C-alpha cells in the first residue's frame, strides 16, 4: 500500500504559516500529531509575532487531509495518503461574504519521520470594522462534510465546502472555499470517484500558554460512497 503504510501509527506533524491580511503580517507555528486510522489530528499552534491580526477560527481550514480515515472499502480513494511521501500542493481561496478574502498555498510532505505542512496566506479586500479584522468571531467551530471530487486534467483533486462562523452579536458569517491539491512527484497518484470527508473539530487553549494560540482536535472520515 504506496504511501498508506506511512500512516499505520502515530505521526508527529510540523505547521509552518506565514500570513498577511490586509498588509497586517503574522507567521503561526504548530506541532502536534497525526492518528490516520482513527482520523485523528491534534495540533497547537502558536502565533510567533504576538497577537493574530484575524481570528483562530478562520484559519482552522487552513491550519493534513492525510490524517483522513478512510474505511476499507475506499482505501482506492484517498488521493492524500498516495501523494506521499513526496507530498502535495494544497491551494485554496476562501471568500468571507460581505468582506475579504484569504488564498492559501499549503506543501504537505514528509521530512524524515516528521509530516510538514510549510503554508503561505494573503488576505485583502477586509473590512477593518468586519467580523475578520473587528474580531467578532466566536471561538467555537461547526461540523461540516467536504464534498471531494477528481480533477483528472491536473491529476489531482478538488473541493469545494461553505464554513458558518458564529458571530458573537449573533448570526453567521459565510467562508466559501474553493480547494485545488496536485501532488509534488511525478509518482502515481489515486484519483477518486466523488465521496466526502466528515469533520467534527473541537477548538480549546492551554491554559499554561500565556502567547495567543489555539490547541485543535479534529476527527475525519471519508464517507458517501453511495
Ligand atoms: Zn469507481
Same mark, same amino acid.
Given at each position: ?23 497586517? &503580517? ?6 502536534? =500529531? @497525526? !492518528? ?6 491534534? /495540533? %497547537?499552534? *502558536? ?55 484569504? &488564498? ?6 514528509? =521530512? @524524515? !519521520? ?6 503561505? /496566506? %494573503?488576505? *485583502? ?102
Amino acid at each position: 500500500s504506496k504511501g498508506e503504510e506511512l500512516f499505520t501509527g502515530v505521526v508527529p506533524i510540523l505547521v509552518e504559516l506565514d500570513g498577511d491580511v490586509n498588509g497586517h &503580517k503574522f507567521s503561526v507555528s504548530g506541532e502536534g =500529531e @497525526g !492518528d490516520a486510522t482513527y482520523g485523528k489530528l491534534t /495540533l %497547537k499552534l *502558536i502565533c510567533t509575532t504576538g497577537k493574530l491580526p484575524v481570528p483562530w477560527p478562520t484559519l482552522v481550514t487552513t491550519l493534513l487531509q492525510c490524517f483522513a480515515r478512510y474505511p476499507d472499502h475506499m482505501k482506492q480513494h484517498d488521493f492524500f495518503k498516495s501523494a506521499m511521501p513526496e507530498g502535495y500542493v494544497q491551494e485554496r481561496t476562501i471568500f468571507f461574504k460581505d468582506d475579504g478574502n484569504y &488564498k492559501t498555498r499549503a506543501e504537505v510532505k514528509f =521530512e @524524515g !519521520d516528521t509530516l510538514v505542512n510549510r503554508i503561505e /496566506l %494573503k488576505g *485583502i479586500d477586509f473590512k477593518e470594522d468586519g467580523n475578520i479584522l473587528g474580531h467578532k468571531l466566536e471561538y467555537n467551530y461547526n461540523s461540516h462534510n467536504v464534498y471531494i471530487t477528481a480533477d483528472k486534467q491536473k491529476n489531482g483533486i478538488k473541493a469545494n465546502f461553505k464554513i458558518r462562523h458564529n458571530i458573537e452579536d449573533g448570526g453567521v458569517q459565510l467562508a466559501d472555499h474553493y480547494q485545488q491539491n496536485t501532488p509534488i512527484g511525478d509518482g502515481p497518484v489515486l484519483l477518486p470517484d466523488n465521496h466526502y470527508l466528515s469533520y467534527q473539530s473541537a477548538l480549546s487553549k492551554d491554559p499554561n500558554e500565556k502567547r495567543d494560540h489555539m490547541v485543535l482536535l479534529e476527527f475525519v472520515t471519508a464517507a458517501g460512497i453511495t
